[PDB]
Amino acid sequence: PLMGGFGLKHPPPQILIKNTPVPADPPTTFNQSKLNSFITQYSTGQVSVEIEWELQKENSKRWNPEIQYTSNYYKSTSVDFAVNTEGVYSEPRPIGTRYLTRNL
């Protein structure tokens, strides 16, 4: 896929969810029209997702040190990839995957 990632013919399927309609009180005389009065509802719960990933370990025979992703050592008002004083979490930068090197 051009945005990056894994192209799958048979990807993780779409998981669809809805609240079942609960009709409000119907009239006491029959009417053929579909019901349009429902009790106002929402749902909440927890969701868990577990993914197993396979790794290809680095086997660098290079003599000199490599580039590594590192947090910056210096003093900051906030720590990167944490919450601020108001409880808002932020991701301050994009992090790619190409730090290690290999020959062609």
Which residues contact its own copies (rule: CB under 8 A)?
1-3, 7, 20-32, 34-35, 38-40, 42, 44, 46
Nearest-approach distance from CB 11 to its own copies, in angstroms: 11
Amino acid residing at 86: E
Residue closer to its own copies (CB basis): 22 or 47: 22
Residue closer to its own copies (CB basis): 25 or 52: 25
Q: Residue 72: which residues within 8 A CB-CB, separation 6 or more? A: 80
Q: In whole angstroms, what is the distance from residue 71 CA to residue 79 CA?
A: 9
Residue closer to its own copies (CB basis): 13 or 27: 27
Nearest-approach distance from CB 68 to its own copies, in angstroms: 27
Q: Which of 61, 62, 57, 67 is nearest to 96 (CA)?
A: 67
